[PDB]
Design a protein around this ligand. Structure first.
Ligand code: 7J8
Length: 323
């Protein structure tokens, strides 16, 4: 009867879970949804819950899900993407500044290798430094202490907190391309639970799905391991899917970046697809035509092979061993 939704207890995970449950209740007003509250450790804890039929589905930020999931789990819904951009919050003394106009040697807080690599390259006169804590803690550090002049974070995190007004600068791709999956939510479920897969398949957004298949296929084929600097940009326009991807050394000084495109129509109709169909980069979308999904996957693989031909494996190897 009731659909059990497991969640981490942190505030942003609860907000994300609530928003997905709200969309499910809009399609299914006659159904009961119960929220059960209980990093890579907690991902496995939620997977255990799901393996043991303690919960039926779990909501993650998509960028937080590896491109290979354990067997028995799949991503049963890619929700419509929120804003994928990275953003800057400034120290309060910096009224109306941007990263371009901060004094030289200002310290910017980020614990993302990806952001730090791209931003050191774009802003060589700033210092980029690790900062610890959840979003409320980083904002306190910034408001109360003098170490940091600014911090970097995902716009969609602040947006979900109701704190969009804290944003002082939205970074564009030439400054900082986003992480694979950033801004999309993914729902993880048991790989062979057909009732729940049909249920959450109403959440799939076809454009976001194809974009993220391509972003994820690209990342998987690079085989860089976790936490190397890799970033993407995707757009669907005029029948084309565009994928830009890049890799960087930790200090940003070495980089390879290329763009490929493919003719991929965004499907507007749901279709009743076959059940034997294997998942693509951990995603199961049986109600969306399969052809465009495979084409999005092939685009990511292609762009990854191009980058590897131009030397990406050596950049990723060095970055991985120096993190
Ligand atoms: C091998 C491998 N492991 C993973 C899982 C994985 N993903 C990341 C990316 C990551 N996560 C966070 C924290 C965060 N998650 C969501 C938000 C809000 C935005 C949103 O919903 O999209 C946030 C906060 C925020 O971004 O503001 C971060 C940022 C950490 C920080 O700011 O200090 C990042 C890094 C980034 O965006 O560049 C991680 C890293 C976690 C970390 O660095 O703290 C991990 C696990 C790990 O590497 O240990 C993946 C998937 C990565 C992807 O798809 O983007 C992979 C890749 C693979 O399978 O090859």
């Amino acid at each position: 009867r009731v659909i059990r939704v497991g969640t981490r207890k942190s505030q942003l995970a609860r907000i994300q879970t609530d928003s997905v449950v709200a969309t499910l209740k809009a399609s299914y007003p006659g159904l009961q949804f119960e929220i059960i509250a209980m990093k890579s450790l907690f991902t496995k804890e939620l997977e255990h819950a799901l393996e043991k039929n303690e919960v039926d589905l779990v909501v993650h930020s998509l960028k937080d899900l590896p491109t290979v999931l354990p067997p028995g789990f799949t991503i049963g819904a890619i929700c419509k993407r929120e804003n994928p951009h990275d953003a800057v919050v400034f120290h309060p003394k910096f009224v109306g500044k941007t990263l371009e106009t901060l004094p030289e040697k200002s310290v910017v807080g980020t614990s993302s290798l990806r952001r730090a690599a791209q931003l050191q390259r774009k802003f060589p006169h700033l210092e980029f430094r690790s900062i610890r804590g959840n979003l409320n803690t980083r904002l306190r550090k910034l408001d109360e202490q003098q170490e940091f002049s600014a911090i970097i974070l995902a716009t969609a995190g602040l947006q979900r907190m109701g704190w969009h007004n804290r944003v002082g600068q939205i970074l564009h791709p030439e400054e900082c391309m986003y992480a694979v999956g950033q801004g999309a939510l993914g729902v993880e479920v048991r790989a062979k639970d057909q009732d729940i897969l049909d249920l959450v398949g109403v959440l799939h957004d076809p454009e976001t799905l194809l974009r993220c298949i391509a972003e994820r296929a690209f990342l998987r084929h690079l085989e860089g391991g976790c936490s190397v600097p890799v970033a993407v940009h995707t757009a669907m326009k005029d029948g084309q899917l565009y994928l830009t991807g890049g890799v960087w050394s930790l200090d940003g000084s070495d980089s390879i970046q290329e763009t490929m495109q493919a003719t991929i129509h965004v499907p507007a109709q749901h279709e009743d697809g076959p059940e034997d169909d294997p998942q693509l980069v951990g995603i199961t979308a049986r109600n969306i035509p399969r052809g465009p999904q495979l084409a999005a996957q092939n685009l990511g693989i292609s762009l990854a092979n191009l980058l590897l031909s131009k030397g990406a494996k050596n950049i990723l190897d060095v970055a991985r061993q120096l993190n």
